[PDB]
Design an enzyme around this catalytic site. Structure first.
Site: not given
Ligand SMILES: Cc1ncc(C[n+]2csc(CCOP(=O)(O)OP(=O)(O)O)c2C)c(N)n1
Ligand SMILES: Cc1ncc(C[n+]2csc(CCOP(=O)(O)OP(=O)(O)O)c2C)c(N)n1
Ligand SMILES: [Cl-]
Ligand SMILES: [Cl-]
Ligand SMILES: [Cl-]
Ligand SMILES: [Cl-]
Ligand SMILES: [Mg+2]
Ligand SMILES: [Mg+2]
Lengths: 665, 665
Positions: B25, B65, B260, B355, B409, B471, B518
């Site tokens: 690249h 890259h 690229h 847990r 996460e 869940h 749990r």
């Molecule tokens: C998570 C992920 N998705 C896709 C790819 C494949 N890939 C490598 S570079 C790129 C994007 C190229 O654009 P940019 O980050 O702007 O790089 P530039 O070509 O401008 O150097 C992608 C999709 C990757 N390596 N990782």
């Molecule tokens: C991807 C994901 N991560 C974590 C959880 C656990 N979980 C459920 S609701 C919540 C956050 C609660 O906050 P918000 O979205 O503001 O809701 P509110 O308590 O105000 O109803 C989390 C971490 C989930 N359901 N999905």
């Protein structure tokens, strides 16, 4: 006021059901009910008598823990959600599960619970609506025209998939997507300030969204106002930030994280009802005036909206009979009669990667199947997914069939789920098999909802070569084979690839992962004949022993099938006869009866070698305790691909050598 | 100018390495060389003579890259990367793989390639730097004090992981984190405008970052001015958008996506060096005065700096000998001698969710092991991860040990890799096992880099109950089992949980996932005595057949070991005698010699039933052909956990009926 009483009714049905279940999430329904009420009874166009009305507005509860709010509204609106259903919240086999499950509750449009994803699935729905409108709205007939709404919370807005999806939606100017943000300064662990402090407005504005703020989440005139401004501005998706008090009305628990996720308790629920002026002695109580209010505002307008849309459709039918017959098949999930004859067939010798033969299947189908629609996460030129001539899916030309998802694997997975839920389209997304991990939770919700999405997963093995082990799948295959209701097909050559595409497009009720190579694969000679039925049955005898009675079986998948055939040819020259088994899909082979599986893996042939450039997990099921596995249970390397394969043992010689050891020769 | 000549050397080396590899690249190195040279030679504090100097600035190339840009600067600066190494780019066993590999290359701080994760690993590194500064620094001794720099591209900034990480880093006001964004309006498929049109500056300001724009990415003075501003505002992390032309200097290919990820080709290479005025006409050539320049800007200043820090350190030793002694031990990766004595031991029958016993173990280890640092993704209340009295990791109090990652996460997982890479900390992260899918790519990167990160994955099964199938884990275990270099432990009870934590903390070269319940599980009879060696050996006979002669084996993991022992008891009461096998870790068992494996799994005893509430994949390896598997190859349900487990067949009476059936009884 009747509006207030409906809102208190929603708030109190939600509390009581959660009390009876001794489980669930009261705080969000308590604070969000006014905004949900207002949207559901004053702005949203839907028909409880027909939750499948194709031009209904689509609603998504991204903050899925709040599901008793959804079910309350469903029940009072006259969807097929009964009072006893609400008394079965979170109970075995009920229609009111603790988080929204599509296919288990009438009117529920998407399975949520995994945070962030509902927003991104709504983006998918909004994209399907614009693409379908541009395909079918002709000559004055606006047959596809509706909004997509979603309610989200703080957690949704912290998840990256929602950042990816907001960026994509703003880029595509999805003006019919309106998100209400339940903004209550509380998450599961406590105050929002523990983890989160962005200017959400400034951020959504950077994506190109319209931002609106509601100061008082209990004031339905301020809410209705925001909704009117959002629906007016069709040039941009809108985010309505609605400030609420979580658990509003609970004198001791409002505004605390304690009310997020456990029942109020009998004492505090009593005090809340008193704070609400909710005088009534009975639980699960709905005044008749509330059912009447909902009849007037939802049930009865909804049926006229749909009736009136049925009239426009009948006229479109007569004006444009072919186009309307196509739309009606699209809605019904059917493919055009005889489309499959458009699939390519490849002669022996012809060598091209299965990503390239995938490329050709796509363009072949794309003419015969107008409903095909998709793209890649910035890898169209590597995945070979472009529909040539198909158009770019852009605000100036939503008729275009190529979607430029950008580097957003996870938004792409969930948008695909959303398009499939909308209905009317067959949809696919491409990326490197290794980065399928980036959308893994979307693949899971596809499986759980049973959505026949299609994943175009290329660059499937260490043969990728120089980009190295971050780019070389090892475990991804096993990791999908273990997922329920996910079909996985790793075709062995160009013909198995057309077969795999065909089965994936014929799927109605489960996602299909197509596992494809970077490197050339020469086409085998039997596959033109056998691939469609062979791949249909998951595994078959692509190359039987020439002396009929094999001394051992070689089991392989994808690119390794060719390797095994060349070993077979070397072995028979020495007088050693083996049968090669192609195994493009474990899930479909396990769907067959043992009568068939025993014809493919005859119990008497105990000598079996598996050949697959991926983890060995699971292979013992097919090779047995006298068999051997030639796999990879380690990461790859950065080198020309044919060299990695060689140092890792995927050579003709090593296969012959391990086969001979199996036989004591 | 010597500055230009060194910048051109970088570019030519990058071009030559790619040409010879016929893979690579060139675009990003060509456009981003000026900014990287400016950072590397004028602002970064690093010592080529000791890449492990603990108070060096940490640098991450998120846009991995562009590896040759990194390898050029490393070679030219006097790191242990030779010219022959550069001439071996992308070749087998080479010190210059196609994407950067931590531990395979001197000076390389992280494995990248998978986009987005480099930024979030750098966030984690900056988090590490501040937690360690707050712990050890005293008045007159800012012994821990350095920057974190990364270089990212457009693709990085589409990825959800980098939005999460940017949000968290703004929220944590990590002023020493400075990111250079190679903004060249191009991505792999074409123009940036296919998929991406956001106002990056506005989004990053919404996070709380400082934003700086360099308009001419070739002007190293303008770059220097931005780095000076960015290094001076310690109240906020900085993003510097550097406007560059990708493939700069290539008259034909500059500014196109075709530069690229493919070599220039010999023609465009010749033309490019002409544009540069590079007339030496020798590939892989470095002017002697360029080396000498890098030795004057990097090698000599670097040695002086580490030496000054080492003088600082000895001064810190004299004034604060105990803290310096603790610091030295943390840097070298040691644990306080005797810490394991602090672990709890549970009487049989004491009943506790794993847990909750994990929570107990965490606070026990935390009091005895100062370097333990961690948190949850808004699930501390449910994962039981909080370190009690440990403080909150905030700008008020970076010495706090509890990190509030929010509902992020994937940024959590990637940032844990960052902290492990920085050095000096034992790190963990908590979330629901089912949402471990959200950080799957960072788990893979921990495995690849061999980082002893600890995942606290609670709510492991259908016992989760009312929250429903979104869940409830099914396939996650199998998915992690198949991954190379990842340890997966599913302890049977509180003692196996203690022992699991101990082994995960003792790990130096691989990450560990802890699969926790749990619901309560009673403490088995023999685990107080056997857990440590037992979990250490991955699988062990936890309750041998009473009569000393097993008729069958019950194989189980986690909460199902309990169930298996009750069945055994019932069976023994009818005259049937079985041995129960605990298998907390498949990976640890497969690392035992066969002699021991045949002792836990006697080849004689052909009749075996595996018992596990998750997918069946791979259990045939341990039950064998006359075996049987009681598993779950479908999704879960919304109901009380007991109800689901009974409907799904995890009851005493069902294990007994299966076992008897196995024995024709
Ligand atoms: C998570 C992920 N998705 C896709 C790819 C494949 N890939 C490598 S570079 C790129 C994007 C190229 O654009 P940019 O980050 O702007 O790089 P530039 O070509 O401008 O150097 C992608 C999709 C990757 N390596 N990782
Ligand atoms: C991807 C994901 N991560 C974590 C959880 C656990 N979980 C459920 S609701 C919540 C956050 C609660 O906050 P918000 O979205 O503001 O809701 P509110 O308590 O105000 O109803 C989390 C971490 C989930 N359901 N999905
Ligand atoms: Cl490629
Ligand atoms: Cl180090
Ligand atoms: Cl190392
Ligand atoms: Cl001291
Ligand atoms: Mg909230
Ligand atoms: Mg770019």
């Amino acid at each position: 006021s009747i509006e207030e009483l409906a809102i208190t009714t929603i708030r109190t049905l939600s509390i009581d059901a959660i009390e009876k279940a001794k489980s669930g999430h009261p705080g969000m329904p308590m604070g969000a009910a006014p905004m949900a009420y207002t949207l559901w009874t004053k702005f949203m166009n839907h028909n409880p008598a027909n939750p499948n009305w194709f031009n209904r507005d689509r609603f998504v509860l991204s903050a899925g823990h709040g599901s008793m709010l959804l079910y309350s509204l469903l029940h009072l609106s006259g969807y097929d959600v009964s009072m006893d259903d609400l008394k079965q919240f979170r109970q075995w086999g009920s229609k009111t599960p603790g988080h929204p499950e599509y296919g288990h509750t009438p009117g529920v449009e998407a399975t949520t619970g995994p945070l962030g994803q509902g927003i991104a699935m709504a983006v998918g729905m909004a994209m399907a609506e614009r693409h379908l409108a541009a395909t079918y709205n002709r000559d004055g007939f606006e047959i596809i025209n509706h909004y997509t709404y979603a309610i989200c919370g703080d957690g949704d807005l912290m998840e990256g998939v929602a950042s990816e999806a907001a960026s994509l939606a703003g880029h595509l100017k999805l003006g019919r997507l309106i998100v209400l943000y339940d903004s209550n300064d509380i998450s599961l662990d406590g105050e929002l300030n523990l983890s989160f402090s962005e200017n959400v407005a400034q951020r959504f504005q950077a994506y190109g969204w319209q931002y609106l703020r509601v100061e008082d989440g209990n004031n339905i005139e301020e809410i209705a106002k925001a909704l009117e401004e959002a629906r007016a501005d069709l040039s941009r998706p809108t985010l309505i930030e609605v400030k609420t008090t979580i658990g509003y009305g609970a004198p001791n628990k409002a505004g605390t994280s304690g009310v997020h996720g456990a029942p109020l308790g009998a004492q505090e629920a009593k005090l809340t009802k008193e704070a609400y002026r909710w005088t009534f002695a009975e639980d699960f109580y709905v005044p008749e005036e509330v059912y009447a209010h909902f009849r007037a505002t939802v049930q009865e307008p909804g049926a006229k909206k749909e009736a009136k849309w049925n009239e426009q459709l009948a006229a479109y039918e007569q004006a444009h009979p072919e186009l309307a017959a196509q739309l009606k098949r699209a809605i019904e999930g059917k493919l055009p009669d005889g489309w499959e004859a458009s699939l390519p067939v490849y002669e022996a010798g012809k060598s091209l990667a299965t990503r390239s033969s995938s490329g050709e299947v796509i363009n072949a189908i794309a003419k015969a199947v107008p409903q095909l629609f998709g793209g890649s996460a910035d890898l169209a030129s590597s995945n070979k997914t472009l529909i040539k001539g198909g158009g770019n899916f852009f605000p100036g030309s939503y008729e275009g069939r190529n979607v430029w998802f950008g580097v957003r694997e996870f938004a792409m997975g969930a948008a695909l789920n959303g398009m499939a839920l909308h209905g009317g389209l067959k949809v696919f997304g491409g990326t490197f098999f290794v980065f399928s991990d980036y959308l893994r939770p979307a693949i899971r919700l596809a499986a759980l909802m049973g959505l026949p999405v299609i994943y175009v997963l290329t660059h499937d093995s260490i043969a990728v070569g120089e980009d190295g082990p971050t780019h070389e799948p090892i475990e991804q295959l096993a990791s999908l084979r273990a997922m329920p209701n996910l079909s996985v097909i790793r075709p062995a050559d160009a013909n198995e690839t057309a077969a795999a595409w065909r089965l994936a497009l014929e799927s109605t009720d489960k996602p299909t992962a197509l596992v494809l190579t970077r490197q050339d694969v020469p086409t085998l000679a039997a596959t033109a004949e056998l691939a469609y039925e062979g791949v249909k049955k998951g595994a078959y005898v692509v190359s039987p022993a020439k002396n009929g009675a094999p001394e051992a079986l070689l089991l392989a998948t994808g690119s390794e099938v060719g390797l095994a055939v060349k070993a077979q040819e070397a072995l028979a020259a020495e007088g050693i006869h083996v049968s090669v088994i192609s195994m493009p899909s474990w899930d479909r082979f396990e769907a067959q009866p043992k009568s068939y599986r025993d014809e493919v893996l005859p119990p008497a042939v105990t000598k079996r070698l598996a050949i697959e450039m991926g983890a060995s997990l699971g292979w013992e099921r097919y090779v047995g305790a006298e068999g051997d596995i030639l796999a990879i249970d380690r990461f790859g390397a950065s080198a020309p691909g044919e060299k990695i394969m060689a140092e890792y043992g995927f050579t003709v010689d090593n296969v012959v050598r391990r086969t001979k050891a199996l036989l004591g020769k």
